[PDB]
Design an enzyme around this catalytic site. Sequence first.
Site, PDB file in Angstrom:
ATOM      1  N   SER A 219       0.832  -1.230   0.000  1.00  0.00           N
ATOM      2  CA  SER A 219       0.000   0.000   0.000  1.00  0.00           C
ATOM      3  C   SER A 219       0.856   1.266   0.000  1.00  0.00           C
ATOM      4  O   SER A 219       0.304   2.307  -0.351  1.00  0.00           O
ATOM      5  CB  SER A 219      -0.935   0.011   1.160  1.00  0.00           C
ATOM      6  OG  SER A 219      -1.445  -1.288   1.401  1.00  0.00           O
TER       7      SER A 219
HETATM    8  C1  LIG Z   1      -1.467  -2.438   2.057  1.00  0.00           C
HETATM    9  O1  LIG Z   1      -0.318  -2.811   2.254  1.00  0.00           O
HETATM   10  N1  LIG Z   1      -2.578  -3.169   2.189  1.00  0.00           N
HETATM   11  C2  LIG Z   1      -3.880  -2.499   1.921  1.00  0.00           C
HETATM   12  C3  LIG Z   1      -4.833  -2.668   3.088  1.00  0.00           C
HETATM   13  N2  LIG Z   1      -4.757  -1.622   4.124  1.00  0.00           N
HETATM   14  O2  LIG Z   1      -3.540  -1.030   4.285  1.00  0.00           O
HETATM   15  S1  LIG Z   1      -3.210  -0.485   5.676  1.00  0.00           S
HETATM   16  O3  LIG Z   1      -3.198  -1.617   6.712  1.00  0.00           O
HETATM   17  O4  LIG Z   1      -4.231   0.590   6.071  1.00  0.00           O
HETATM   18  O5  LIG Z   1      -1.803   0.096   5.617  1.00  0.00           O
HETATM   19  C4  LIG Z   1      -4.717  -4.046   3.734  1.00  0.00           C
HETATM   20  C5  LIG Z   1      -3.357  -4.519   4.051  1.00  0.00           C
HETATM   21  C6  LIG Z   1      -2.540  -4.563   2.744  1.00  0.00           C
HETATM   22  C7  LIG Z   1      -2.950  -5.575   1.826  1.00  0.00           C
HETATM   23  O6  LIG Z   1      -3.325  -5.279   0.690  1.00  0.00           O
HETATM   24  N3  LIG Z   1      -2.797  -6.848   2.290  1.00  0.00           N
HETATM   25  N4  LIG Z   1      -3.087  -7.979   1.566  1.00  0.00           N
HETATM   26  C8  LIG Z   1      -3.726  -7.938   0.379  1.00  0.00           C
HETATM   27  O7  LIG Z   1      -4.939  -7.752   0.302  1.00  0.00           O
HETATM   28  C9  LIG Z   1      -3.048  -8.739  -0.752  1.00  0.00           C
HETATM   29  C10 LIG Z   1      -3.867 -10.010  -1.020  1.00  0.00           C
HETATM   30  C11 LIG Z   1      -3.062 -10.929  -1.872  1.00  0.00           C
HETATM   31  C12 LIG Z   1      -2.007 -11.506  -0.905  1.00  0.00           C
HETATM   32  N5  LIG Z   1      -1.444 -10.511   0.039  1.00  0.00           N
HETATM   33  C13 LIG Z   1      -1.578  -9.118  -0.438  1.00  0.00           C
END
Ligand SMILES: *C(=O)N1C[C@H](NOS(=O)(=O)O)CC[C@H]1C(=O)NNC(=O)[C@@H]1CCCNC1
Length: 466
Positions: A219
């Site tokens: 992110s």
């Molecule tokens: C960012 O790194 N994200 C987006 C989201 N929120 O970000 S935050 O915690 O507010 O900084 C959720 C955490 C992360 C994310 O996308 N994590 N996983 C995913 O959805 C992908 C799914 C596919 C496998 N892992 C990555």
Amino acid sequence: AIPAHRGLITDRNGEPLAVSTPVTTLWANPKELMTAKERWPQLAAALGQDTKLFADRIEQNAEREFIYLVRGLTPEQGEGVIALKVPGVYSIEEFRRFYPAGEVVAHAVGFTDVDDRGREGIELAFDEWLAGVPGKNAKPGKTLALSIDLRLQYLAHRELRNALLENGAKAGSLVIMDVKTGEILAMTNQPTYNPNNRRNLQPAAMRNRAMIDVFEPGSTVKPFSMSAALASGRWKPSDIVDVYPGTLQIGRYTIRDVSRNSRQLDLTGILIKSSNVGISKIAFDIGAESIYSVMQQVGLGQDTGLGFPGERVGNLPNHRKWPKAETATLAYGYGLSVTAIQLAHAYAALANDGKSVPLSMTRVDRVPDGVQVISPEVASTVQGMLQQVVEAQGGVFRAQVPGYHAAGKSGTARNAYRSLFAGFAPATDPRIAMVVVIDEPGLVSAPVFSKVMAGALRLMNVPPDN
Ligand SMILES: *C(=O)N1C[C@H](NOS(=O)(=O)O)CC[C@H]1C(=O)NNC(=O)[C@@H]1CCCNC1
């Protein structure tokens, strides 16, 4: 071989980080020692060596004219073992490296081997400058002032170590950069080691994580996907994307948001809620080429040109044509790999109105001209949006820097997960860019950003902008 005095390394403000101290090194002509066998055991004893192994060494090197007894006694220790007056046993004035700051700057500074040759970090990278030349007279090496501010290094060291305890995390890194000059003001990893005492050193403690640990940034690259959207000419900050119901099927692949209480989000909204769905929809509209090109221009998966030993480059794949899935996964930061350093350099470029200054580990007196990698308006817009990510309701409140306007993005990096915060402050006239990385500890690394950034800005006498 009359060894040269090795160049002093200081912090940016002249505090000593690596000092070559005169030591004494006793050496022996074995052929002249084989005539005073009765003296050996007095000699061995004063070198705290076993009489039999001492004797066995000498005995087996009978047909040789040089051996090392002990390397690097104090001034008055080596004078005591020459006052015994053993035949064939002479003195050398030599130089031993001492690291006054120890653990605090271990990875950055590195250390020398038994020969006073660079082995790790700055000691290797700048060996030719620091060494000078042996004696012909010995010409001494030259002084090197690093970019590191030891006040910020200690604050960064202290706070990452604390945060690793609270969260029972086993490792992490923290980088602080001057966004105006390209200087690395602080670079700290845990675990660390004392370079003064190098017997039994767990090799995980040696790892310069800031420069060698590669991860999918997640992110934290969304601001660069957003930069590409704003430069396409098809998107303004107040344009809306529909993210309902917080999922999107890519043929067989399915994209899920972490927060799914959204229908219409503006471009600021997509960053506050960190919607993978919102950023994917925008990414389809502009094409992965615009996103690839921004990420490349700000140096993600690119050589940093620090010429620092061990430093990894990561990988930003140029698919040239991207299908829908590879388009989305690049936009929300999987499908590339980067270091903490690369990510802080990228954020620095954003904080500095879109101008990338080349990275420096050495004090910069004359700043080299930056390159405009993002247009000044786009960069000013994304700054505004990242200020809202920290300030706004629903936002990352625990990254707020009391007194100042901070800007930044959390993320989860990737197998093995790291907690990430990347940001800069003050939002009005950015001075510092910072990246925090905590191994398998959203709201882990963000409070570290807050504490370290509050200290750094005050230590650099940056006037509060709130
Ligand atoms: C960012 O790194 N994200 C987006 C989201 N929120 O970000 S935050 O915690 O507010 O900084 C959720 C955490 C992360 C994310 O996308 N994590 N996983 C995913 O959805 C992908 C799914 C596919 C496998 N892992 C990555």
